[PDB]
Amino acid sequence: NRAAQGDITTPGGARRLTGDQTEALRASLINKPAKNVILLIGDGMGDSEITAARNYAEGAGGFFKGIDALPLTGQYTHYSLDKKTGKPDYVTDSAASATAWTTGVKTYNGALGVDIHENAHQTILELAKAAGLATGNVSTAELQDATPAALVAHVTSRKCYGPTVTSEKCPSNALEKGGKGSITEQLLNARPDVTLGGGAKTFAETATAGEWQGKTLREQAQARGYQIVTDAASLAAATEASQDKPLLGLFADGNMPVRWEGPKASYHGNIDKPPVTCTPNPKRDASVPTLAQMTEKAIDLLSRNEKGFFLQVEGASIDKQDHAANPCGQIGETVDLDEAVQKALEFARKDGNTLVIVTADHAHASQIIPADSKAPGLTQALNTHDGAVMVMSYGNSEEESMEHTGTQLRIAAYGPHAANVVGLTDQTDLFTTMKAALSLK
């Protein structure tokens, strides 16, 4: 437990530590190989996002049972590259950062699974599958979005979701030009044991060449032996996932609906509007599985493989709500990731042979600022679990979408080989860390 231990008005009362940690940390250091690796990504979940979500949902002196309970912690860098010159670009997008940890190569903003020369590099999922490990790719975004797509697709622009855009924007990747295909075509070739998220929209496009030309991508997936589930009940009813019968979960046309709702932040919103209590998203239905449900089911089905498994889990809309200057949307998706981390840690503690890693692809806009601030951007006051007011601020864009930020951010881990996230590391180290933990050549 790392909650405040007592009365925070008294000496010692706000300590998170009960005593010396050296021996416990010593025991947390395990050099043996990992049998399984679970990587959980909060898109845009920098330290500010964690801190704001903790303050709101757990209180300042509270504790995230998942996100905050991983004992080995460091900071890593996620800068990308300018495509033409190869020099650093200090603020990455989602595609170049995912490429970094899935392949170990830096690349340009928007690239998926290729380097600045447009050369494809093998991903951690492809390597694990080549060694006979089971593989899983779970997200609350559309499955074609950068973060899950990077594990399975190699294209020159993250926009190349299906055949139609790929033909126009990634012509060397287009199937009718001899390429590997759109992101969705390449997903279906990669064939993870378990693929769960949104993005049904693109599966109604039809292939332009190949053995399944004329068919919709959904028809292709059906014909190639995928079992398709579409809601929480059908997901719960799945009992196996394998290369013979891979599980594909398509739970929404686009991204799946976020959990919480609130007003967008506004100019002088902390001043001229009352404090906010987050409420449920009315678009959110219980027929749609939560991130925790798909994480627990993925772990269940992947753990039947005797050689072990690799699973990536993305809480994807932390970032997208941060872009839209919506603190309630953003915080809710961070609470949502915490519930998934809890599922991974619960499995990993009883298993004893699982490396769990929790981090973000890059940092984002939101800032915690004083309640009486007069700021030039969008702000909002929130009623927290402490019974106090917190103000969040989005101050780095005058356009519709807030910007990513370049700050280094927390990476945390539990289990074998977790020591390799401590100190200052780079996002491309994370690839090598998971390759080595799983003993992959």
Known binding residues for Mg(2+) = 43, 145, 147, 314
Choose which of 43, 58, 115, 126 interacts with a second copy (CB under 8 A). Answer: 115
Q: Which of 351, 236, 237 is nearest to 293 (CA)?
A: 236
Q: How far apart are CA 329 and CA 338, in angstroms?
A: 15
94 is catalytic: yes
Q: Residue 96 Cβ, how far from a second copy at the closest point, in Å?
A: 12
Name the one range near a second copy by CB under 8 A: 181-189, 220-228, 275-283, 414-422.
414-422
| Binding letters toward Mg ion, positions 208-237, x by CB under 5 A | ------------------------------
- Which CB, 30 or 91, lies closer to Zn ion? 91
Closest-approach residue to Mg ion (CB): 147
Strand 309-315, strand 134-142: pairing:
parallel
Cα separation, 418 vs 403, whole angstroms? 31
Enumerate residues 142-161 that contact Mg ion by CB under 5 A: 147
Q: Which of 160, 361, 379, 413 binds Zn ion (CB under 5 A)?
A: 361
Closest CA to 347 of 407, 295, 272: 295
Backbone phi and psi for residue 329, each to the nearest 5 degrees, phi listed first: -60, -45
Q: Residue ranges for the binding site? A: 43, 94, 145, 147, 314, 319, 323, 361-362, 404
Contact characters 281-320, Mg ion, x per CB under 5 A: -----------------------------------x----
Binding site partner of 337, from Mg ion, a second copy, Zn ion, none, Cβ cut-off 5-8 A by kind = none
Nearest to 83 by CA among 119, 34, 59, 56: 119
Closest CA to 275 of 327, 347, 238: 327
Is 374 near a second copy (CB under 8 A)? yes
Tell me, by CB under 5 A, how many residues bind Zn ion.
4
Neighbouring-strand partners of residue 380? 392
Q: Give the residue from 77, 69, 23 showing the smallest Cα distance to 424.
A: 77
Task: Find the part of the chain contacting a second copy (CB under 8 A) among 49-57, 239-247, 306-314, 337-345.
Answer: 49-57
Q: What would the two tokens of residue 407 be?
A: 């700050």
- 34, 40, 43, 156: which one contacts Mg ion (CB under 5 A)? 43
Angstrom distance (rounded) from CA 426 to CA 149: 21
| Tokens of residue 350, six digits | 């009883």
* Candidate residues 142, 193, 319, 338; the one interacting with Zn ion per rule CB under 5 A: 319
Euclidean distance between CA atoms 254 and 251, whole angstroms: 9
43 binds Zn ion (CB under 5 A): yes
- Dist CA 221 CA 215 (whole Å): 10
Residues with a catalytic annotation lie at: 94
Residues that bind Mg ion (CB under 5 A): 43, 94, 147, 316
